[PDB]
Symmetry: C6
Subunit: 69 residues, 6 copies
């Protein structure tokens, strides 16, 4: 019904490398493993739990089609 | 007042105007409002980037946008 | 009841130059056209939309009667 | 909530000079005129509306008997 | 059932010196007078009100039993 | 279903060293001692309380199962 879900779900389903930018000026990288009401797991060497409230932007490494409905 | 978010974001969208979104950390994002909902804005430029409104300070159009109001 | 609405309305009605300080450090300038539960529209050249969650303090440029 | 209203009320009544520090490191000064669920009106030369969500700490300039 | 209340109660009655670190990096000091759902009153020379939303970490100066 | 409960529980169960990056860019280390809807207890040399609203990301120092 909303946007968050399909956007993250395409990125993950596609295992596309993404960048996640934090409010503190840090730039995380890796693939979107899973997500939540509150968190995303970004997979790199380890799984890391990023809190949505500390996220500024989510930026794919390339155009991902069909981020649909 | 009334609800001002939608009529403003919608104006910027149908008119495919270039905007600058400013983050709470004082970083500047550019592009066009592709879509938006209760929590996020999709800013199309070279890709689509999901921006969380909670991380957004101010939205600025690059030129005046008519009505921008219901 | 609330203070935020009588206070802003007086600035809007009397169309006074205000300085909106944001949590980053940036000092916004201009006039308040309208507002909302979540945003203020500050005008100068363009109509720009501020989220209240990023505002620290609203300072009038000159004294305003913001009574009740 | 009920630890806050009595603290600010006491400050306001004594018209005590206070020091408001914001989540960004800036330090505001003046007197508490009014307050709300969301805002404090700190009076200086002008009345300035401060959002609580942007404040970290409110510091009395001298002791104040609260609740 | 939470940890945040037994944790602050323990520090309170024990009057152990704590260090409150703020979201921005500032370090407050003193003893925990009382507390709320939204605020903590940190006493030293004066009673200062700290907003929890601006608090990053609460670090007691000595080990404390904090159970229930 | 919560994802932050299994992840935190696994990390704690295994007593694994983690790094907690705060909304200010400072890194905290230790082991997860317990946790709340609002806080985590990071055990290092002292039992310290970290608020979740000040946490960017939680980083296990080595791969963990989190089945």
């Amino acid at each position: 019904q909303s946007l968050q879900d399909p956007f993250l779900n395409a990125l993950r389903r596609e295992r596309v490398p993404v960048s996640i930018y934090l409010v503190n000026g840090i730039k995380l990288q890796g693939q979107i493993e899973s997500f939540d009401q509150f968190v995303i797991l970004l997979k790199n060497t380890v799984s890391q739990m990023v809190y949505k409230h500390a996220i500024s932007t989510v930026v794919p490494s390339r155009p991902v089609s069909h981020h649909s409905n």
